[PDB]
RNA sequence: UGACGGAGCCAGCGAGUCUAACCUUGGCCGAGAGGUCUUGGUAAAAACUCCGUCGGGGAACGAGGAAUUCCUAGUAAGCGCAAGUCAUCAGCUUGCGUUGAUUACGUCCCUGCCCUUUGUACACAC
RNA sequence: GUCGACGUACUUCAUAGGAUCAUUUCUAUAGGAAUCGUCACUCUUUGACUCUUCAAAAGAGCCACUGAAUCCAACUUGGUUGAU
RNA sequence: CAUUGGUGAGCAGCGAAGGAUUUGGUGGAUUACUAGCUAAUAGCAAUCUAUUUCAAAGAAUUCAAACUUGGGGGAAUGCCUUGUUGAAUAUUCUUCAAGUGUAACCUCCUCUCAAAUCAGCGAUAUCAAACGUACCCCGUGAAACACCGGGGU
């Protein structure tokens, strides 16, 4: 009264949880904000805080223009910088031949804010502050993330070339 | 439910399903009985299967045939085929065997179309 | 193998046959323990690759011409 | 296609269940219930009551 | 057989999808055993892939008769029926007659009350190459397809223009000895294929000194087919015509049998297009 | 795939003349077109009863 | 191997919202287009079984000469039904069923057509 | 006429940078969270066991002895003052 | 009408102080029966120990063996083989290389099927109801051959 086709009992190996590998076993639609248009974000209104990367700190550097007041020439309006925690751990992770770049940017009219992130990338902390309130404007000077931010709408960019700064989506460039 | 078996036949395009299950010897095509073939020349060619074995082996059977396709003499040569191919195979499953081989040996002695159909194949020379 | 239509109730275990339980390895020589039985050798080119017993069957009589006898090919022989 | 390659040996486990017409087509049923092809007499004493 | 005819047949089409795969391969390998002897650029693709590039190393050892034909090209002679289509008249009953006069192995087997399906499979039966059925039209013929048998491809031809050898004089008799073909002016790749369709249907390796010639025109999209004797004279060879003169075109060429009627029509003649009327073989 | 080795097993399925019960034999290309089920068995029964043709003169 | 009616029952291939006339007499409605109704003319399973009634053409023609052609078994022949397949076919073509025989199935004597005339393919025989 | 050259047309060729994992510690970085001798309870996951459905196929077979259910036949009890 | 389908009520007939199924356990066969145990020419079976030790015999591959490796490519550390320093009257360990050597190791293939089910999409259809058309009746209403509602065929 034996079963037919008798098979020797194995290990079932597309199967089991005794493996690491099979060891495995609500929609979010983010809304825009509230203060933005098409691609207004009424809410940018003075005083403005800007979010610097590196590359804007070297290039100001390297074209002679010193923060605060130098961003008072493109911008035109009331403005106050603040720099993360991450950009000025890395900025300062370049080295010694940025120390003069890193002793402007340690200053009491440059704000300084905190941050938390288990890293140190300096575009993907920027990109994530802008994401969740599309309040800030960003300073930066590379195509990696200038790319990154000219995606989201709402969102002032400005960067550096020449002599001076140059805004790209703010309404009120004069 | 009671015993039962099923045979076929086959001329030209003329099929017979004949039913053979026991009791009280009766024998029917079509709903009507055997005494009623219409092409009145070929009805001693069904009657043939029954003349040869002798009527006392199909006072306890029962056979109902029916038949589609065919014309007439194609009709008339399926339901000799079944009935001797129902006979045949009614006594080599409930019946005797060495019945069924003496009904056998009847019927090839006499014609082979009574229990297997030759089918009239072309042949090229 | 078919030499018995009635084969014996005490050869059956709860699982398998017994005789059909490979016994090779509890001989004490080498040559007869490696086994090289292909799966499906089925009237092969040997016997150690049979992986069974050899199944009893006839396959060629005829009559003796002369002295009133058949001879027929067999398992065991002729 | 299909019907010029049908392979006439072939058994899937419903050829018990399923019937067929004696003209050649297959039937199935009209409730389509694989319970409700008759009635017992304990079904039909009590339908008839009510 | 029936099961067998299935199964081969399957294991065929499958292997002709297998080789339509293998022909870019097999392109691609041609660039390989350029590539090593003469030109050293080797493309962009062909350059990554080590999976071809170990590829190679076996299929180095790599190197046309039609490849339904490509077994039985010349190793049995082919035997073949002529049939009519049904209830023949008595014209193409001579005209059968001298179609298998004309084509040697030939036999002629009436045709009446068989069915389609059942003489195809008498065929396959006894064993034949293919079979030539004659449609006609109140005495002269009009329709002739050659089909052939183990499941190979069929191809129907439309004939206008006969006149036979029974309509003239008491000319003799026609010579049946094994004939030479002549083809002329086939080039399409449809040509190649109706080439191979029909001269197989003629016995393996005729004489040197065969003395019968039946010739295959294609002066005009027409494929028209005459048979001739002749001798070779002191100055200049002579010709005489016997036999049916044709004026013949295909209008179908299916991959299966003539049995099928579903089957992969690998070429159709259309004549309800703007470019019917302009070339030859579509 | 599994119910093939059952009914092998239980002795119904032949290679021609002779009823194969080994499940583990290869079948050549050529050997695989006479694959059929054995006579006067019940696996062949139920297969021709759903058909209606069963012709029992041959006792299938 | 007839005519006249009356019964008996047997098939298979078929099924694109695709299936299928013309001419005429009128009336009513309508601005017309036409619509609706009216009227008349023209063209357009058999076989078999069985039951009864029946017993020369309006000049050519009462089963077809010489001479020729085709045909070996589900064949010749007879009978209807269906389809109209990119060629061909409606003056017809192609399928599918029903009924289903005679006579050779040998011979190279005649008429043709081809082959062979070193056995070379290994024994024996010849 | 199979090609060459030229002309023209089409197609194709480089992407950088950050983070994690992979050395039985350490993928190279100090910007990072894991060092414990189990007692219990809850919740799921998976497998085995015994039946079982789609749905059957096949019985290491025979006989004897002794028991368990199910439906009848019969007996008892309840029941038109009402059984299922 | 057939049912060659199920479920139930009975009859003819079969019919010796019951008869049908279905199932657990055990016993006997399933090859042809010379008895149990032990240290066995005998003893035990209620035991071999205060009788079971001595003697005799007993050492070659002189220092021998994976006949048992999925395939391709290697093999750093391993392992094997052959050549390279030190103990002794021709020699154990050890110095380092070379192996188209290697069943330790390290990679690719040894799985992705001419294959089935399952889910979604659904046609041929089929059952019930609604709705539409025609003809009758009924309800509300003073009434409208009802414009309002319902029923039936």
Redesign the pocket.
């Given at each position: 009264?034996?079963?037919?086709g008798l098979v020797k009992?194995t290990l079932?190996t597309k199967?089991?949880?005794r493996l690491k590998k099979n060891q495995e076993?609500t929609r979010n639609i983010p809304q825009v904000s509230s203060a933005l248009f098409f691609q207004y974000n009424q809410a940018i209104k003075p005083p403005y805080q800007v979010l610097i990367d590196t590359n804007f700190i070297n290039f100001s550097i390297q074209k002679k223009v010193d923060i605060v007041r130098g961003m008072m020439d493109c911008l035109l309006a009331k403005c106050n910088p603040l720099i993360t925690?991450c950009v000025?751990?890395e900025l300062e992770?370049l080295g010694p031949k940025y120390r003069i770049a890193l002793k402007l940017a340690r200053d009491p009219r440059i704000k300084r804010l905190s941050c938390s992130?288990?890293?140190?990338?300096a575009?993907?902390c920027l990109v994530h502050r802008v994401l969740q309130h599309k309040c800030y404007i960003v300073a930066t000077n590379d195509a990696?993330l200038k790319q990154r931010i000219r995606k989201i709408p709402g969102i002032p960019l400005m960067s550096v070339g020449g002599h001076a700064y140059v805004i790209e989506k703010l309404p009120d460039v004069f | 439910?009671?015993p039962?078996v099923?045979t076929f036949g086959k001329?030209?395009?003329?099929?017979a399903?004949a039913?053979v299950?026991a009791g009280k010897g009766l024998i029917?095509v079509?709903?009507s009985p055997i005494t009623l073939v219409?092409?009145?020349?070929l009805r001693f060619k069904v009657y043939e299967p029954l003349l040869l074995v002798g009527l006392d082996k199909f006072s306890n059977i029962?056979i109902?045939v029916?038949?589609?396709?065919?014309?007439?003499?194609?009709?008339?040569?399926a339901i000799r085929q079944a009935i001797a191919k129902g006979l045949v195979a009614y006594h080599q499953k409930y019946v005797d065997e060495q019945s069924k081989n003496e009904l056998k040996k009847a019927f090839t002695s006499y014609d082979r179309t009574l229990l297997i159909a030759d089918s009239?194949?072309?042949?090229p020379? | 193998n078919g030499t018995?239509?009635?084969?014996?109730?005490?050869?059956?275990t709860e699982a398998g046959?017994?005789?059909?339980i490979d016994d090779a390895g509890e001989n004490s020589d080498?040559?007869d323990?490696?086994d090289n039985s292909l799966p499906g050798s089925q009237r092969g080119g040997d016997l150690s690759t049979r992986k069974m017993r050899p199944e009893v069957r006839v396959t060629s009589v005829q009559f003796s011409p002369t002295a009133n006898a058949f001879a027929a090919a067999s398992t065991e022989g002729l | 296609e299909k019907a010029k390659e049908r392979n006439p040996d072939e058994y899937?486990?419903?050829?018990?269940?399923?019937?067929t017409d004696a003209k050649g087509l297959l039937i199935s049923s009209?409730?389509?219930d694989?319970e409700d092809?008759?009635?017992?007499?304990?079904?039909?004493k009590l339908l008839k009551t009510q | 057989m029936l099961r067998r005819q299935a199964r081969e047949r399957?294991?065929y089409?499958?292997?002709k999808a297998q080789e339509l795969q293998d022909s870019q391969l097999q392109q691609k390998r041609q660039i390989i055993k350029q590539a090593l002897a003469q030109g050293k650029p080797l493309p962009?693709e062909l350059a990554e892939d080590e999976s071809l590039q170990?590829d190679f190393r076996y299929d180095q050892s790599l190197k046309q008769v039609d490849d339904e034909y490509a077994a039985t090209s010349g190793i049995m002679d082919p035997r073949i029926i002529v049939?009519?289509?049904?209830?023949?008249?008595?014209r193409?009953?001579?005209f059968?007659?001298?179609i298998?006069l004309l084509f040697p192995n030939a036999?002629?087997?009436?045709?009446?009350?068989?069915?389609?399906?059942?003489?195809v499979d008498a065929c396959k039966k006894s064993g034949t190459t293919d079979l030539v059925?004659?449609?006609?039209?109140?005495?002269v013929?009009?329709?002739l397809t050659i089909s052939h048998f183990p499941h190979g491809p069929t191809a129907?031809?439309?004939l206008?223009n006969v006149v036979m050898r029974?309509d003239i004089i008491?000319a003799?008799?026609?010579?049946?000895?094994?004939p030479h073909l002549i083809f002329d002016n086939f080039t399409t790749a449809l040509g190649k294929r109706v080439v191979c369709i029909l001269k197989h249907l003629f016995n393996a390796g005729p004489?040197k000194d065969?003395?019968?010639v039946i010739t295959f025109a294609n002066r005009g999209d027409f494929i028209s087919v005459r048979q001739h004797v002749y001798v070779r004279t002191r100055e200049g060879v002579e010709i005489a015509e016997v036999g049916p003169r044709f004026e013949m075109?295909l209008?179908?060429l299916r991959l299966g049998t003539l049995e099928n009627?579903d089957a992969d029509?690998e070429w159709?003649?259309?004549?309800?297009?703007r470019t019917?009327n302009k070339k030859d073989y579509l | 795939?599994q119910?093939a080795v059952?009914?092998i097993e239980?002795?119904?399925v032949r290679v021609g003349p002779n009823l194969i019960n080994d499940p583990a034999y290869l079948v050549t290309?050529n050997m695989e077109d006479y694959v059929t089920w054995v006579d006067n068995?019940?696996?062949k029964?139920?297969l021709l009863r759903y058909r209606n043709q069963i012709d029992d003169f041959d006792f299938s």
């Open positions: 009264t034996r079963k037919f009992r079932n199967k089991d949880q076993n925690d000025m751990a992770k992130h288990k890293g140190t990338y575009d993907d990696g | 439910a009671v039962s099923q001329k030209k395009s003329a099929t399903v039913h299950k029917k079509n709903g219409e092409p009145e020349i029962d109902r029916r038949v589609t396709g065919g014309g007439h003499v194609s009709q008339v040569y009239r194949r072309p042949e020379k | 018995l239509e009635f084969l014996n109730s005490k050869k059956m046959s017994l005789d059909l080498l040559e323990r490696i | 899937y486990h419903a050829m018990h269940s399923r019937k009209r409730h389509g694989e092809e008759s009635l017992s007499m304990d079904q039909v | 399957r294991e089409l499958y292997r962009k170990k049939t009519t289509s049904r209830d023949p008249s008595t193409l009953s001579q059968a007659k001298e298998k036999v002629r087997l009436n045709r009446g009350n068989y069915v389609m399906p059942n003489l059925v004659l449609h006609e039209h109140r005495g013929p009009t329709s129907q031809f439309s206008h029974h008491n003799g008799n026609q010579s049946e000895v094994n004489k065969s003395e019968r075109r209008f179908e009627k029509v159709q003649l259309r004549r309800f297009i019917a | 795939i119910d059952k009914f239980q002795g119904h290309r068995s019940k696996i029964k139920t």
